[PDB]
């Protein structure tokens, strides 16, 4: 069965005293005016439960909680037993063992952080077949930190079951320290307004409460329809790698590139991605990828990285300080080393200067070490510009050959022929969608364009340097990106002292783009009481064709008042008409007078304050 | 002739176009787009980049608010003087010299 829990489930949020204050608590509570289940059975324990039972002869004993129906709480004739054990439970009527309709019982059950909390309250009632109307708070009873997981529960034995949901409440702590009232902050616009001004009374006026944003209905990915995988194996499972001073640069293009193949390959002793997190490459897109391959000892592999210094960094192969890509190195001792010491791998050691990044040098002129010109004299004072390697597998592991590849790519905002494995979806337009073009994540409304892009441009841009125009990676059509419609939410309220009715103002929207707790919020979303003004969509007021003095100012010459009772919307009137009977020979003269005393109030001073720098910022530290 | 009204409109135009144009600065991170950071890093360091953009945009918005608040006092003094002029010149004959 079902029923309506008007205002229940409020429990003291924590063991902290407050007085005459109106607090704001964000915690798991039971929303007011909620459809809750009525019983005279296995029931789930979502996150929290509001159990309220009316009985007179104690027809109920306790509860059973857990997932694999686990802890028992029961109340026999006099005492109560609390313990968690493996029991022989369809029940009918160890870690810890805490064995210690006129009457109404409300219980709140929560297990957060593994701590089990019980809140309780009793009250006399002379009522039948209905939840009593009133406000009451549930004090804590006992905290048991069993540290077990629970998914469902069932009582021991009419009653009601309510579930707690994440909500924020405005609670009212009296001088005696007891919550005599509360506000469900999400129930209706009026409650939200009472939240913004932390009081249960709201004077007449207009109040801005929240921001309203249309939400992405769906998600759209548009990627190139190319199919051939990037020949990563040809780069890695190749025949042999060139000597470092002549590092091969092999480009990768026009291919879908799965990088999970490199991740799952567990023969890589160093996989550190620099410009991007490795686990996101499969969804990005790239302009072009360069694979630079060469062989270096493990000690000198550290030279191959952005913004470092070393002989190979300066004389042979330099990665710039703003490198974009991933660096892959692995052992190839079995396939890149001779028995007597291989010297096929060579490196440049006698150069006249350093190298700018990505610069290859094949210079073949004798290096000078003395002060005399070399003139092709090899030996003293003139060295050969290169140096050799010694490759025997009998040395320390730091000296073994390491085939090292730098998967350099430009992640520029460019045509991006290369992409990852991502499944393109059909293109839907004119709707607020969470699109994804070539990795340009974002949300908005896409429409046809009257623009013309240059045959190499990939997307437009706004003055804010934000994307507002794109070309479809599959159909080459210009699309218009407009951010999803939005605005502020204002509540048009006659004072709470006067009425609980409210009207809602949506700022800068068209009354069709507005579509929320439905039993309260949705009433202020449709009907024949929706009005569109120059300040946005006004919902909850009647557009009368009269005109009166401005009572609550909406905007653009529109004011709204509470009249008959309901709320009206009118174009304000400046004042009463008149026509002074002017004539060339007609004057008017007073025959009496009046002495009228009026008042002007003018602020003169304000409280004098003085805040200490150290005491406020650091205090006693 | 209408220099003052146009100046007010223009000072509103800039210092607001400046605020919009300030939404595209690195402030020390890899990119000026949050999503570009989001779609390129794990949260443990995309957090650092987003934090740097947050600090930059917070300084920018606070500075803009302060300038607007100061300009508001100037416009308010002008409007109070205009109301005084309306009451004393329009609703009467003034004996104040050059007012």
């Amino acid at each position: 069965a079902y029923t309506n829990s008007f205002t229940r489930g409020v429990y003291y949020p924590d063991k902290v005293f407050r007085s005459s204050v109106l607090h704001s608590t964000q915690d798991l509570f039971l929303p007011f005016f909620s459809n809750v289940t009525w019983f005279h059975p296995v029931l789930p324990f979502n996150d929290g439960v509001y159990f309220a039972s009316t009985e007179k002869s104690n027809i109920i004993r306790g509860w059973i909680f857990g997932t694999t129906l686990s802890l028992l709480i029961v109340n026999n004739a006099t005492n109560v037993v609390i313990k968690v054990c493996e029991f022989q439970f369809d029940p009918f009527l160890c870690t810890f063992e805490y064995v210690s309709f006129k009457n109404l019982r409300e219980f709140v059950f929560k297990n957060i952080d593994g701590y089990f909390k019980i809140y309780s309250k009793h009250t006399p009632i002379n009522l039948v077949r209905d939840l009593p109307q009133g406000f009451s708070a549930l004090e804590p009873l006992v905290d048991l930190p069993i540290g077990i997981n629970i998914t469902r529960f069932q009582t021991l034995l009419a009653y009601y079951v309510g579930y707690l949901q994440p909500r924020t409440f405005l609670l009212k702590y009296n001088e005696n320290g007891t919550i005599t009232d509360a506000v469900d902050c999400a129930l209706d616009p009026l409650s939200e307004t009472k939240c913004t001004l932390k009081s249960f009374t709201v004077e007449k006026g207009i109040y801005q409460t929240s921001n309203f944003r249309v939400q992405p209905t769906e998600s759209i990915v548009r990627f190139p329809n190319i199919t051939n995988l990037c020949p990563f194996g040809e780069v890695f499972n190749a025949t042999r790698f060139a000597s470092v001073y002549a590092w091969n640069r092999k480009r990768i293009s026009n291919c879908v590139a799965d990088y999970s193949v490199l991740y799952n390959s567990a023969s890589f002793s160093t996989f550190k991605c620099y410009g991007v997190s490795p686990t996101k490459l499969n969804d990005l897109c790239f302009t072009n990828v360069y694979a630079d391959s060469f062989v270096i000892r493990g000690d000198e592999v550290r030279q191959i990285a952005p913004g470092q210094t070393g002989k190979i960094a300066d004389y042979n192969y330099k990665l710039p300080d703003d490198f974009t890509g991933c660096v892959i190195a692995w052992n190839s001792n079995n396939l890149d080393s001779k028995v007597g010491g291989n010297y096929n791998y060579l490196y440049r050691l006698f150069r006249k200067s350093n190298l700018k990044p990505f610069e290859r040098d094949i210079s073949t002129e004798i290096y000078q070490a003395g002060s005399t010109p070399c003139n092709g004299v090899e030996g003293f004072n003139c060295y050969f510009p290169l140096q050799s390697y010694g490759f025997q597998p009998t040395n320390g592991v730091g000296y073994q050959p390491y085939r090292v590849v730098v998967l350099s790519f430009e992640l520029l905002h460019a045509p991006a022929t290369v992409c990852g494995p991502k499944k393109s979806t059909n293109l839907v337009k004119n709707k607020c969608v969470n699109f994804n073009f070539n990795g340009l994540t974002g949300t908005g409304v896409l429409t046809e364009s009257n623009k013309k892009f240059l045959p190499f441009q990939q997307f437009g841009r706004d003055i804010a340097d934000t994307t507002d125009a794109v070309r479809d990676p599959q159909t080459l059509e210009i699309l218009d990106i407009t951010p999803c419609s939005f605005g502020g939410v204002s509540v048009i309220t006659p004072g709470t002292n006067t009425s609980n009715q409210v009207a809602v103002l949506y700022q800068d929207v068209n009354c069709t783009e507005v579509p929320q707790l439905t039993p309260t919020w949705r009433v202020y979303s449709t009907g024949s009481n929706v009005f569109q003004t120059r300040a946005g969509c006004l919902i909850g007021a009647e557009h009368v064709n009269n005109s009166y003095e401005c009572d609550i100012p909406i905007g653009a010459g529109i004011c709204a008042s509470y009249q008959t009772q309901s709320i009206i919307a009118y174009t304000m009137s400046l004042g009463a008409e008149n026509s002074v009977a002017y004539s060339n020979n007609s004057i008017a003269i007073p025959t009496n007078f009046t002495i009228s005393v009026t008042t002007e109030i003018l602020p003169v001073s304000m409280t004098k304050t003085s805040v200490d720098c150290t005491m406020y910022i650091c205090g006693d530290s | 002739a209408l220099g003052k009204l146009q100046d007010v409109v223009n000072q509103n135009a800039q210092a607001l176009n400046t605020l919009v144009k300030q939404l595209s600065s690195n402030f020390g991170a890899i990119s000026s787009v949050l999503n570009d950071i989001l779609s390129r890093l794990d949260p443990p360091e995309a957090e650092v980049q987003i934090d740097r953009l947050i600090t930059g945009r917070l300084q920018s918005l606070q500075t803009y608010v302060t300038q607007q608040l100061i300009r508001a006092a100037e416009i308010r003094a002008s409007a109070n003087l205009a109301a005084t002029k309306m009451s004393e010149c329009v609703l009467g004959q003034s004996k104040r010299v050059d007012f």
């Epitope: 002793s269 160093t270 996989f271 550190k272 991605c273 997190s277 490795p278 686990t279 | 794990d42 443990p44 360091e45």
Partner: nanobody, 121 residues
């Protein structure tokens, strides 16, 4: 920093073993530890990775779907539970400190004591 690994032994097909190592000289909650094995006389390999929190786990393609990785931050212990074990897995296994925190890149600046793991029938 100090590392001593525990576990390992003669294991037959379908068997299990538990490896653990502590980290001192730093709290170890921030850093990420990988599992590395070198077959004798061959190259070192990356077996599996764990996120700094413990939520994200990655494995080599070789051990995907067969091995269980788990670590406990509070007593600083990293564990590896291995299923469908075989003579193919024979290697010296290393738990390494990745020198860095709150990042997912996989490589190690340091190498632990290692364990001698002999797999035979």
């Amino acid at each position: 920093v100090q590392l001593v690994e525990s576990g390992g032994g003669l294991v037959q097909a379908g068997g299990s073993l538990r490896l653990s190592c502590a980290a001192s000289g730093f709290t170890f909650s921030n850093y990420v530890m990988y599992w590395g094995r070198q077959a004798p006389g061959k190259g070192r390999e990356w077996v599996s990775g764990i996120d700094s929190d413990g939520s994200d786990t990655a494995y080599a393609s070789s051990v995907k779907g067969r091995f269980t990785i788990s670590r406990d931050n509070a007593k600083n212990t990293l564990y590896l539970q291995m299923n469908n074990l075989k003579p193919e897995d024979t290697a010296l296994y290393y738990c390494v400190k990745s020198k860095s925190p709150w990042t997912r890149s996989e490589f190690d600046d340091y190498w632990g004591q290692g364990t001698q793991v002999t797999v035979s029938s």
